Ligand binder design. Structure first.
Ligand SMILES: Nc1ncnc2c1ncn2[C@@H]1O[C@H](COP(=O)(O)OP(=O)(O)OP(=O)(O)O)[C@@H](O)[C@H]1O
Ligand SMILES: [Mg+2]
Lengths: 585, 49, 464, 51, 592, 226
């Protein structure tokens, strides 16, 4: 325990404090305020206190935690709302019985009073143990079962004593590991430095797709499990439930406190509209919610805490999708810390390390085989809302996000004003994961890449035809151009404008999306063949109005039946469309 | 590809005003062109008749 | 034979300093240091046992200022012990490095043994004597029509690749590596990754393995996860490896320095960590000198057949030449290959924009003995008429296509058939420089003979 | 009247195309350059104050 | 002998050096690195070492030489390459057997073993000799013959003994001068501080043009022998090629090619190509390399040595000027000299001033550019020399608003601006004819009226044609070319022809490598006569479209006039041009 | 804000604090920061201005336990009428919505010089509901905004293409713009308009259109109110 020597704003200097590691969190003051060491000059160690520094006196003890900013990984994370530095807001409110957060509150980030049903793993006493090796399992919640307990990654040695099965408190010792002295006792939880990434045995290529549920995002601009994604900032709700990821780490809640309250209310209220009849959405999603009133360090470390939680869940083999929101707010917090530190501005006042930190944070995400036995694979999908500054993509944070992230979905303000959903601009959005996803598409749905390329070409031709119709008379366009424009209009009306509010098209699966793609491709091919045969466009439209209506209703078809029932309906629709087109000729 | 303007706050504001006026003139002249194009199509039909 | 070995058999005890006067940012200050050097690499042993490696940057009387490569996080005053190696950073270099994959700091990440060093060479190196440096005048048939007819690359040229974030610079740079060869009859590629993502690094590794070049490549992978301070030393390691393999092993070497924008961002972070000058756009005033220390290590030397060619891959922030990184890189290097977002969006591969592209080693290595005698005139005429076509296209957009004259219409047709047939090229298709010249002559034959004012009349009569 | 309207429409369309393609990139690039230059001046002042 | 106290970058604050002078040359480190004192804070003395600082330990000895950074003027400079501190790179390579430059090599700045034929001057024993007087000459090479040996400035007295004619080395005594009873021994060479300009009797207003060999530079924006010249432009604009072409084909007697921050490959190209080329001066074909020395301090060489390279080059130019020769210094990057100054200033801690460049940058550039100028040499016999400084500024970001560019434009008289738009599209020289200016056009009227009387009028006509066409292109690019007059169309066509054929010069093509002054004047006459004939024919009533269709042959003949090789001679080339105008006049009268 | 927190949370009442001259507060923060020997941020203002303004703003809001509320209307003064200015930028970031007072409106007329084109409220949909106020509020406000934009476009287009050549939907929109900037926005400094009275006046302006012209309003609302 040291002593405060100087306070000048949230810059506390503590003297007689030798042994404080770099960036080590400390307990500043008599109210146990938390702060990080940003520079050492011998005994003195300058500290950036997170909370308000008013009232700090000279000589106030400064306790040393001994570890940097760390996140308490372990059971009890899933159904919890956290702050930027993982302050358990729910338990804080329950303990304090007040609407405010008391300064220097020391409520543990994980419930130490709850009892967890622990089941020991295959490892027994005397067996050599390695970092990340599973030595037990805990039933945490119904939606998230078998919370596999992992040894801390840096830990190594041999197992000396393991507790048997039963209901154990989160603070009770569970495993003793000996390595040149049995100086290690491991409970159900372990702390990991938030900035330091969790190691993996080998990072793997991200091949399996991320089924967002939305037809546009699942067909034209796909994302892979373990891949990064960008959104200008409906999509957030879709990834929360419709995504097939076994866990969700929401680190958003926006800069506005009202947005945070709305997100907190909506997440617990929403149920598992995806697979799973009776299960709350919050049963697998941890909310790292940070408002602008929260400490700037907490606002900057919110995404880091969330990504470390996501990597912890990945180390158990679960596919995780960490939906990040208000990256503009995070960048503002980072710029505020840079200005507080006096760091030289680089671009538009932003610090010189913004691009480097963003690149490292996005490189945290990826599919990787977890460290230690048994061999298991996990994934951390990142979907970070870029939140362009001032409505334009000129901010350095936005430029870096678009530079490192591989998928941009490009929600369009004009399309939103047109009451379209999800209003993704097909001309600006892109996805660089098509080349990797071709493997899975060949494995499962072979014609899907060809159909997607066909729709991309159709959209380009539709843009060209719209430009032509704006420049000159619409009737001056050729029959083929008119047919392509009509097909693209039908695609935009039915395939892309699938609203999630209706239960018929709330979450279109991959098989339903492929069926709709095949129907649209068949309709376009039939229209092109009819145009080439010499049939009049108006007569062809009059004859194939029924086929167009069937194609439109294919989108409205309920995907509840699934299996071959949906596939059989598409086959009948395709056969009817071909017969109708042939009969018209 | 840039105007020879001395970098200053007054110059920045003048160029923002110029950009807003240029966008407004672009929209107004495009709409005027559309109206005159409709009138010209009507005039062409009347000329043929 | 080799007398440099005898100096190896000399053990030199190194001081273990437990004195740390303080750590601030990425710099750790030491006190009571006994005769510090100025760039000696030191090994900080953290209280947790992990060993960072740093190098001193300023040494006052009995005081040293170390910057550690893996960041200062976790450094404590009481427990950290610093070991002064007494010599600047020295990568262990051997001929067996060809075929290995190392890390950002030179550690082998190939799961194999440590390199059986043949000689320890300082990463900073020394400037090559301009008298001892030969002018590179041997063309390289990179296969790409744009880089072989309009931006021909010499053996010792250091022509980089300018591109934006999403452009396929890696695809083009891999094409050059697999197709690099002299016009008039194998290169030992040295690949350095600085802050590239895992997908890019794996793509380069897999492409080298697929083309079989991996037996002649020594990759220095420093991904985005790797510490941001050793992006400084990674190109130094790569260029020391290339300097060895060329000037002491007689191997023609390709040096690929990808994400030099990321390297310069790391340089800017290091500069802003100290109280250094901000230059332009926040980049250090010595960024020109550092980028020169990187680039100028290429070239051929007198009496030694080895040659090093540098193809650094940059990432222009807003696709702007006026940005400090591309500006200083084009000032130092001997050209550039500009990859165009406009051409990429139009659908051309390679999307190389030849107008911002330049090859300063084309004047030599383009002539009547190295390439065909019409090469220089053809290239000059192609630039002239392609720029005229671009101006005519802008005028078409402004005042309609009808207002253009016969010359402007011919320019538009030439630009269409030039971007669509000449610049456009398959990712795995290589074109001989003579075939590319024949295609260029067809494109010029679009024009009448009179309008070709850049072709010398003898060449025009002989080749039209 | 048709000839006069054709001439006026041609002049107006040429004016719109000129305004957009020339002026809007030109003025936008001028705005970007001015913002960059004042950012550089602010950075130099910040460095002087830090010294 | 002091000690090293602090090493931070290229600056070394060495303690225990009470008595060190400002800019006094020292030897920092055990390898005797060359450094100059910048600040003296007590016994401390901050030093900018001109070598690599890696490996300097706290406590290394620092010797105090006692004399400032002094170049070693004398015979043997002419055909050599130097390292910025006047270290012969050939000697370094031969002594080290390595392609690198070792740290601390102390090779003599001039070869001492070579014996030079010495021919004593008009002075003899007893003649009172003054500073700068010529007491003999040595045969250096076939081109630069009689490398006149000058008495050092500020050295004066009566000649006691003079060496007779023969063969002498540099270390051998050549002269003994008695001043106030103290004898002074003089050798073939003599040292001079680079900071201080070499004295001259009286500078003169420069009047003879510096024939660059490039069409636009020689005609539109001429430069005189003895005037500062500025060449701003981004990378790839053509500054280095313009400088090399000026050094190859200029009318100057000697070249001092200084490369600071330039690539080593440019130096290699010069060393490889200059001996191949030949000059018609001195009545014989001798290699260009015999009258050009190179001060090579590349970009990867130590930062602090760029200033030393600039000063060494300008002092060599001043020496060959005091010899009465017409020298032209070519600093490759004054911008890189300024960036070296900025790096040193930032490492020292001075106030950044503008953009980070030190506050004394303008004064240093002004002094360096004021070193140049035509002048009468210091001592008898009377002879007149000149130094033309043509330095290529390299603006950061390709904008002429950089502090270095602004100071250089303020101090120099000729500004050859380069536009990157013309740097692309292969329009070299990429000279921006709108912003470029030359202030020697007024003084050059004497030479023009003496030799080519119509040159200034033709240049003015071409300039006004270019300005009118610039305005026409500006209005057309936004309002089309459907309303231009016939005169406007003629102006646009003729100026496009001028840009495509006359202004653009392919310096690497045999026909256009060197367009001499007479060829440039004749081609200006051809183009201006073409424009005048077209204007007169159209004003007579001929439609411009039909006139162009009929006179396409004349237009092609005019535009292809650049292909006339100047190697045929003035008589042959002018004979073809006289027929070109006569045919063009006939083809404009028959068509009309 | 401390008084508001007291009243709202320890008294269960609604506050609606109105902070005036956030620019003056920012200048005061500038002087307090520079007195501690700290380098100025972008526009001279301290770098932690975002944190300070975030505290001051986010001191407002509703809570679950208490029936009170703290609404906030921090009234800024944009220097040189620049939105890119740090105080407006940070305030727009932290707060939700914004109300703009227009110099053109002030020159043209009288209180309040508020223009609706750049002014919006982010949580408007919550306030304008069915049970609270009237069920037509959202449709009426959206229709008014759209027709005000069209009226501005028509006012600009009149001097370009002549008054006669304007369409019916443009002439009616110009008339609506006149009666909007002159009767609806134009409010006496002392006259009080309830939300229901304001919506009635909005309908009175919107009734100059044919029932088919009003497209943003729901058909049921059009049938019931028009
Ligand atoms: N007069 C010329 N004739 C023909 N080609 C030229 C001419 N000037 C330049 N070029 C071409 O353009 C290139 C420009 O290179 P150059 O060395 O002139 O660049 P620079 O502007 O001096 O660059 P840096 O600032 O990097 O030193 C030359 O290598 C050559 O290919
Ligand atoms: Mg140059």
């Amino acid at each position: 325990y040291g002593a405060i020597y100087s306070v000048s704003g949230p810059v506390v200097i503590a003297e007689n404090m030798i042994g404080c590691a770099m960036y080590e969190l400390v307990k500043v003051g008599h109210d146990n305020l938390v702060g990080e060491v940003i520079r050492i000059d011998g005994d003195k160690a300058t500290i950036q206190v997170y909370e308000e520094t008013a009232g700090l006196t000279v000589g106030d003890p400064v306790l040393r935690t001994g570890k940097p900013l760390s996140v308490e990984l372990g059971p009890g994370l899933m159904e919890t709302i956290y702050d930027g530095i993982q302050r358990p807001l729910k338990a804080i409110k329950e303990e304090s019985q007040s609407i405010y957060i008391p300064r220097g509150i020391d409520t543990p980030a994980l419930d130490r009073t709850i009892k967890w049903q622990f089941t020991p793993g295959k490892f027994q006493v005397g067996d050599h143990i390695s970092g990340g090796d599973i030595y037990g399992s805990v039933f945490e919640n119904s939606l998230i079962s078998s919370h596999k307990i992992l040894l801390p990654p840096r830990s190594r040695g041999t197992i000396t004593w393991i507790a048997p099965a039963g209901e154990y408190t989160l603070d009770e010792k569970i495993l003793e590991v000996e390595f040149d002295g049995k100086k290690s006792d491991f409970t159900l939880y372990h702390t990991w430095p938030v900035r330091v990434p969790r190691p993996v045995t080998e990072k793997l290529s991200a091949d399996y797709p991320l089924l967002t549920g939305q037809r546009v995002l699942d067909a034209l601009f796909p994302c892979v499990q373990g891949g990064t994604t960008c959104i200008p900032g409906v999509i957030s709700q879709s990834l929360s439930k419709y995504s097939n990821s076994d866990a969700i780490i929401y680190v958003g809640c926006g800069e506005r406190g009202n947005e945070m309250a709305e997100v907190l209310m909506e997440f617990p209220e929403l149920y598992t509209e995806m697979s799973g009849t009776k299960e709350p959405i919050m049963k697998r999603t941890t909310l790292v919610a940070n408002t602008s009133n929260m400490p700037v360090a907490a606002r900057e470390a919110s995404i880091y805490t969330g990504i470390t939680l996501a990597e912890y869940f990945r180390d158990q083999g679960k596919n995780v999708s960490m939906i990040a929101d208000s990256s503009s707010r995070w960048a503002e917090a980072l710029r505020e810390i840079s200005g507080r530190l006096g760091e030289m501005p680089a671009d538009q006042g932003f610090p010189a390390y913004l691009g480097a930190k963003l690149a490292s944070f996005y490189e945290r995400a990826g599919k990787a085989v977890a460290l230690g036995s048994p061999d298991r694979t996990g994934s951390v999908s990142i979907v970070a809302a870029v939140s362009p500054a001032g409505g334009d993509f000129s901010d350095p944070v936005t430029t870096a996000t678009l530079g490192i992230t591989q998928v941009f979905w490009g929600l369009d303000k004009k399309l939103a004003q047109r009451k379209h959903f999800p209003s993704i601009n097909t001309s600006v959005s892109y996805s660089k994961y098509t080349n990797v996803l071709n493997k899975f598409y060949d494995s499962n749905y072979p014609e899907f890449p060809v159909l997607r390329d066909r729709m991309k070409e159709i959209l380009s031709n539709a843009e060209e035809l719209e430009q032509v119709v704006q420049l000159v008379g619409k009737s001056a366009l050729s029959d083929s151009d008119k047919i392509t424009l009509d097909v693209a209009t039908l695609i935009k009306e039915d395939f892309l404008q699938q609203n999630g509010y209706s239960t018929y098209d709330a979450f279109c699966p991959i098989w339903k999306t492929f069926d709709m793609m095949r129907a649209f491709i068949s309709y376009h091919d039939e229209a092109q063949k009819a145009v080439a045969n010499g049939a009049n466009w108006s007569k062809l439209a009059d004859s194939t109005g029924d086929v167009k209506h069937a194609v439109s209703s294919s989108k409205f078809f309920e995907p509840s039946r699934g299996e071959k029932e949906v596939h059989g309906e598409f086959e009948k629709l395709l056969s009817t469309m071909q017969e109708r087109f042939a009969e018209s000729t | 590809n840039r105007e020879q303007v001395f970098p200053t706050r007054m110059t920045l504001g003048l160029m923002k005003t110029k950009l807003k006026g240029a966008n407004q003139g672009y929209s107004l002249l495009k709409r005027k062109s559309e109206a005159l194009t409709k009138r010209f199509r009507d005039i062409t039909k009347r000329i043929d008749d | 034979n080799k007398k440099a070995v005898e100096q190896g058999f000399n053990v030199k005890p190194r001081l273990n300093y437990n004195t740390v006067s303080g750590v601030n940012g990425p710099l750790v200050i030491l006190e009571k240091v006994k005769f510090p050097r100025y760039n000696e690499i030191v090994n900080l042993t953290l209280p947790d046992g992990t060993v960072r490696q740093g190098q001193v940057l300023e040494i006052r009387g009995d005081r040293a200022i170390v910057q550690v490569f893996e960041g200062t996080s976790g450094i404590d005053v009481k427990k950290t012990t610093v070991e002064f190696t007494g010599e600047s950073l020295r990568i262990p270099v051997s001929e067996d490095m060809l075929g290995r994959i190392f890390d950002g700091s030179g550690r082998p990440i190939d799961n194999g043994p440590k390199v059986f060093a043949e000689d320890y060479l300082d990463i900073n190196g020394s400037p090559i004597n301009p008298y001892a440096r030969i002018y590179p005048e041997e063309m390289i048939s990179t296969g790409v029509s744009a880089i072989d007819t309009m931006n021909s690359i010499a053996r010792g040229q250091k022509i980089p690749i300018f591109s934006a974030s999403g452009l396929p610079h890696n695809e083009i740079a891999a094409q050059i590596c697999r197709q690099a060869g002299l016009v008039r009859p194998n290169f030992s590629i040295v690949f350095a990754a600085m802050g590239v993502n895992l997908e890019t690094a794996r793509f380069f590794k897999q492409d080298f393995e697929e083309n079989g070049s991996l037996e002649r490549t020594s990759l220095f992978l420093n991904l985005a996860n790797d510490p941001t301070i050793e992006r400084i030393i990674t190109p130094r390691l790569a260029l020391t490896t290339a300097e060895y393999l060329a000037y002491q092993t007689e191997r023609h070497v390709l040096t690929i320095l990808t994400d030099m924008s990321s390297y310069a961002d790391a340089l800017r972070e290091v500069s802003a960590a100290r109280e250094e000058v901000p230059g332009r756009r926040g980049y250090p005033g010595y960024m020109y000198t550092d980028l020169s220390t990187i680039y100028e290590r290429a070239g051929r030397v007198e009496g030694r057949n080895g040659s090093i060619t540098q193809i650094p891959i940059l990432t222009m922030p807003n696709d702007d030449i006026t940005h400090p990184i591309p500006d200083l890189t084009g000032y130092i290097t001997e050209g550039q290959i500009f990859v165009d977002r406009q051409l990429h969006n139009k659908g051309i591969y390679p999307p190389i924009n030849v107008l911002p592209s330049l090859s300063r080693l084309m004047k030599s290595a383009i002539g009547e003995g190295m390439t065909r005698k019409d090469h220089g005139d053809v290239s000059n005429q192609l630039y002239a008429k392609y720029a005229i076509g671009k101006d005519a296209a802008a005028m078409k957009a402004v005042v309609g296509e009808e207002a253009l004259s016969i010359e402007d219409k011919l320019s538009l047709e030439f630009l269409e058939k030039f971007e669509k047939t000449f610049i456009t090229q398959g990712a795995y298709e290589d074109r001989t420089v003579f075939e590319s010249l024949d295609q260029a002559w067809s494109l010029l034959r679009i024009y009448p003979k009179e309008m070709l004012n850049r072709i010398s009349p003898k060449i025009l009569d002989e080749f039209y | 009247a048709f000839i006069i309207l054709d001439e006026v429409i041609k002049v107006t369309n040429r004016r719109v195309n000129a305004i957009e393609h020339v002026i809007i990139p030109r003025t936008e690039n001028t705005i970007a350059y001015i913002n960059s230059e004042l950012d550089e001046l602010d950075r130099e002042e910040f460095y002087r104050l830090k010294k």
